[PDB]
Amino acid sequence: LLQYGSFCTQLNRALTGIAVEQDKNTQEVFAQVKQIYKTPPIKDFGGF
Amino acid sequence: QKFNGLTVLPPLLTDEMIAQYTSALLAGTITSGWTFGAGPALQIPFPMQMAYRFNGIGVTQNVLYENQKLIANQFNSAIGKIQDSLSSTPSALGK
Amino acid sequence: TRAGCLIGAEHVNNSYECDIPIGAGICASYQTQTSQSIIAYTMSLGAENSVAYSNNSIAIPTNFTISVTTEILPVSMTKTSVDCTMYICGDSTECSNLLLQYGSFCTQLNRALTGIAVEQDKNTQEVFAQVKQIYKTPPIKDFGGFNFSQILPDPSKPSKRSPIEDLLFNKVTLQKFNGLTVLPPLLTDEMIAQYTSALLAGTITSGWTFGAGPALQIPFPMQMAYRFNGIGVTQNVLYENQKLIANQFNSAIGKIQDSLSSTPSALGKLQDVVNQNAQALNTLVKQLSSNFGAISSVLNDILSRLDPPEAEVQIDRLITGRLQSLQTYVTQQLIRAAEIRASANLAATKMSECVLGQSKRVDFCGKGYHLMSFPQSAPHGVVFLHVTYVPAQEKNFTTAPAICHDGKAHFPREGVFVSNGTHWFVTQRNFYEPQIITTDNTFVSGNCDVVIGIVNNTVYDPLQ
Amino acid sequence: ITGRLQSLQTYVTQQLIRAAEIRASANLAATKMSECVLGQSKRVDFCG
Amino acid sequence: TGTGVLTESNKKFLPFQQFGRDIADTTDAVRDPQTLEILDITPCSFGGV
Amino acid sequence: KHTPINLVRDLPQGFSALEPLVDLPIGINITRFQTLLALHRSYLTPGDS
Numbered sequence A: 001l002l003q004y005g006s007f008c009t010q011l012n013r014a015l016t017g018i019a020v021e022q023d024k025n026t027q028e029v030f031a032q033v034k035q036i037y038k039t040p041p042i043k044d045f046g047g048f
Numbered sequence B: 001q002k003f004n005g006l007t008v009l010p011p012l013l014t015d016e017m018i019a020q021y022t023s024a025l026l027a028g029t030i031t032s033g034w035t036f037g038a039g040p041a042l043q044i045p046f047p048m049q050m051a052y053r054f055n056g057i058g059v060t061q062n063v064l065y066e067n068q069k070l071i072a073n074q075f076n077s078a079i080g081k082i083q084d085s086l087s088s089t090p091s092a093l094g095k
Numbered sequence C: 001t002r003a004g005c006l007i008g009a010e011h012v013n014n015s016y017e018c019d020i021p022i023g024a025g026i027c028a029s030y031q032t033q034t035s036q037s038i039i040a041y042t043m044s045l046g047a048e049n050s051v052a053y054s055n056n057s058i059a060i061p062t063n064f065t066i067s068v069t070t071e072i073l074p075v076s077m078t079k080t081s082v083d084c085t086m087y088i089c090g091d092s093t094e095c096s097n098l099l100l101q102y103g104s105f106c107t108q109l110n111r112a113l114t115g116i117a118v119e120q121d122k123n124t125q126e127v128f129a130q131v132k133q134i135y136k137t138p139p140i141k142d143f144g145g146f147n148f149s150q151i152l153p154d155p156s157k158p159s160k161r162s163p164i165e166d167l168l169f170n171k172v173t174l175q176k177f178n179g180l181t182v183l184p185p186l187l188t189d190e191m192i193a194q195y196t197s198a199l200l201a202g203t204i205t206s207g208w209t210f211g212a213g214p215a216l217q218i219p220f221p222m223q224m225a226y227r228f229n230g231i232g233v234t235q236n237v238l239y240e241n242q243k244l245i246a247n248q249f250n251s252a253i254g255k256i257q258d259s260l261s262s263t264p265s266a267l268g269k270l271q272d273v274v275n276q277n278a279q280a281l282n283t284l285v286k287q288l289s290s291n292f293g294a295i296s297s298v299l300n301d302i303l304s305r306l307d308p309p310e311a312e313v314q315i316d317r318l319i320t321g322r323l324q325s326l327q328t329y330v331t332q333q334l335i336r337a338a339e340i341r342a343s344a345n346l347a348a349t350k351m352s353e354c355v356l357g358q359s360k361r362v363d364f365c366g367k368g369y370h371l372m373s374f375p376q377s378a379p380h381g382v383v384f385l386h387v388t389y390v391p392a393q394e395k396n397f398t399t400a401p402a403i404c405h406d407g408k409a410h411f412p413r414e415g416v417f418v419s420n421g422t423h424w425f426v427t428q429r430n431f432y433e434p435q436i437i438t439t440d441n442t443f444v445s446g447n448c449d450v451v452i453g454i455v456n457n458t459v460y461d462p463l464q
Numbered sequence D: 001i002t003g004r005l006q007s008l009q010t011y012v013t014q015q016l017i018r019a020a021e022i023r024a025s026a027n028l029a030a031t032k033m034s035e036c037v038l039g040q041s042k043r044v045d046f047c048g
Numbered sequence E: 001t002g003t004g005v006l007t008e009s010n011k012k013f014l015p016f017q018q019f020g021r022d023i024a025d026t027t028d029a030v031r032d033p034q035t036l037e038i039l040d041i042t043p044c045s046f047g048g049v
Numbered sequence F: 001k002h003t004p005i006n007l008v009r010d011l012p013q014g015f016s017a018l019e020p021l022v023d024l025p026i027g028i029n030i031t032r033f034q035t036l037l038a039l040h041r042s043y044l045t046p047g048d049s
């Protein structure tokens, strides 16, 4: 296998890039609030 | 699947953490309208917030106030139908 | 852990912000303050804050802040090109004769790479060439207190680039091989800087009008007053607070150059394209040293001592290996070109809708209500300076959605009703400005006995 | 070696393309969360 | 064997190396026989048309 | 590699790269070795050597 050069470093690199980006996708979709908001104990939403 | 060199890495955000994110987003929406996306979250009575969103389509607020009971009933029913729809139609999560 | 057995880091009960991700919610970092060792912990998602929800209280800001954020988008990458015949079969007719027997395999690769190279110029043209004329700023800078010198070009420099984009070119940093050549872009950096100068001058001197039709000069305080009127703040806000707003805008602009010069990894999105192209090219070069089974990897040495009737198999092995490597490179570049084209389309959209207009799309041209945006060219990309309106300080006010008068129910034409606790005022929604409630800022509908949660007050009719 | 290596390359290429598609969908999801959740969109048939 | 332009060089070959090679399996400089001199190899020009 | 050293007793820390002297075509098997020292004569008892 060594005689084929870096065919495998390339594939590991590409799959690592995909895997790393899969976390960025979720971070960008969901991590849009800097602080976690909480709902009040009493639910007086005027009928909703 | 994962026996001969194939391995699956865990995602960075656990489902409890993503659910906490969506709880934060939904709580911010309910209690503060859109204000928390731009700056500090500003508490606002929810009927009043819905009134201004109605005003954001060209229906005067007096509409929502004169028929708030009806609108809230209808909204509760429409949310309830989503549960039954997802529970009864297959291939709904096909994507 | 849920990601595996981690050895070397102490587990800490308390949570911090995430620094080096592990997986399953655990991150690690080097503390240096408490621990001069490596700690691992469960992430915190951010600070907890309950919001003061109640059925009768509003929070309306009493101040604002103007903030300038920066956004970096790739647009193009280097237009590389490689020739089969030299790359695979350098200066050897004996191997080219048997490369010909593979048909069109790498007229096809040349076609693909030429397509990418031609598309890069289209990316740059679509992002920047949005103005039919080159606009220029007047010699006298009477902008009502707004200092733009940090983004307008400086005539004293050998290259007409503004200080900020000069800093960008000084912060991002970018040989002769066999068959690999790099084609120069069609638009030189001077020309791109001239485009962004045209865009900036048109913006400053004409608002958005120059995006729709002929550029119509308007005084800049008046233009900014309109953009304030765009996000729901009456122009008197800007006019009564113009000196403060101009000082604040100048300070925010000044902070940008310092931030870019002092916080590294800010231009990582642009450094990544050059890093990835360099890495792909380095790998493509290093593949020339591989045997693939050959008695020798260098071509002339196997040719020079082995008679063709059996040196042909030896050459064929090398041919197939190198051709496959080149094919892999071309495919990777096609996918990366698709990604860069997506980013260039986003950059063109952002120029149109943030530079040439004022956008109502939330969080599209930065956090906060969008005021206006400034393009700055960067090597192989564009930087956007997004000017936004952000509320600053609020007070809690009691509310009610209506007022009774002699049995009649009044609703706000614009804004909300608020009170100190003794007297009731109408005010606009993003800036505390009370006014006495009059028949001329509210309107009538129905009667008191229908709406829920209404308060009695007197409303003044100016006629009596 | 040749056969398995080329099979792995095919897999990685198709994963790259599928990852690009998922990235486009994730960018659309981030845009939708911004413009529909964090705001109110005047843009027809984008949020329903 | 190979083709290129041959130029004087200031690369101090140590007494034991006889030919240097690039990051690819191609020579970059050589030592001449009969005179023992260091000689730089630069590929002679080419380009697209 | 021959280096003038000032450190007190042991190997220094500074990185240094050895370069070849010779490549002898000996072609023998080597499995053991021993260094050759140079010893003076301080004195001579008649028969000890």
Ligand SMILES: *[C@@H]1O[C@H](CO)[C@@H](O[C@@H]2O[C@H](CO)[C@@H](O)[C@H](O)[C@H]2NC(C)=O)[C@H](O)[C@H]1NC(C)=O
Pocket: C062, C063, C064, C065, C244, C392, C393
């Ligand atoms: C509005 O915003 C600015 C900044 O938050 C405030 O401006 C300051 O005003 C005081 C009194 O005029 C000055 O002494 C300060 O020097 C100003 N700041 C700066 C940086 O120059 C203003 O007070 C704010 N209004 C409110 C209600 O917060």
Ligand SMILES: *[C@@H]1O[C@H](CO)[C@@H](O[C@@H]2O[C@H](CO)[C@@H](O)[C@H](O)[C@H]2NC(C)=O)[C@H](O)[C@H]1NC(C)=O
Pocket: C147, C148, C149, C150, C250, C254
């Ligand atoms: C326009 O912007 C810049 C930065 O805010 C100002 O440039 C300074 O000009 C003075 C006088 O020429 C120089 O002494 C300074 O060294 C400049 N700053 C720097 C960082 O070099 C310019 O004065 C601004 N104009 C206004 C009205 O504020």
Ligand SMILES: *[C@@H]1O[C@H](CO)[C@@H](O[C@@H]2O[C@H](CO)[C@@H](O)[C@H](O)[C@H]2NC(C)=O)[C@H](O)[C@H]1NC(C)=O
Pocket: C050, C052, C394, C395, C396
């Ligand atoms: C807005 O309303 C609420 C309630 O009147 C206030 O919320 C409090 O905020 C402080 C500081 O963040 C917290 O320590 C308290 O715990 C909060 N109250 C509760 C019940 O949790 C908020 O300060 C109000 N703003 C003003 C100007 O009064």
Ligand SMILES: *[C@@H]1O[C@H](CO)[C@@H](O)[C@H](O)[C@H]1NC(C)=O
Pocket: C011, C012, C013
């Ligand atoms: C973490 O909390 C548990 C709970 O009692 C305790 O046993 C443990 O010692 C704590 N560890 C640290 C590092 O504080």
Ligand SMILES: *[C@@H]1O[C@H](CO)[C@@H](O)[C@H](O)[C@H]1NC(C)=O
Pocket: C419, C420, C421, C422, C423
């Ligand atoms: C609220 O406004 C009224 C109307 O002028 C004023 O009399 C009162 O003092 C204000 N409240 C406070 C706390 O100052």
Ligand SMILES: *[C@@H]1O[C@H](CO)[C@@H](O)[C@H](O)[C@H]1NC(C)=O
Pocket: A044, C055, C056, C452, C453, C454
């Ligand atoms: C708000 O809630 C309180 C409960 O403390 C209730 O008395 C009041 O009627 C409510 N107001 C409205 C407008 O529903």
Ligand SMILES: *[C@@H]1O[C@H](CO)[C@@H](O)[C@H](O)[C@H]1NC(C)=O
Pocket: C404, C456
């Ligand atoms: C408002 O006025 C009506 C009749 O004028 C009265 O019935 C009601 O109690 C008043 N509201 C308050 C809070 O006193």
Ligand SMILES: *[C@@H]1O[C@H](CO)[C@@H](O)[C@H](O)[C@H]1NC(C)=O
Pocket: E034, E035
């Ligand atoms: C070859 O001849 C030249 C001519 O002077 C001489 O310098 C050189 O030493 C000769 N080659 C060898 C290996 O001695």
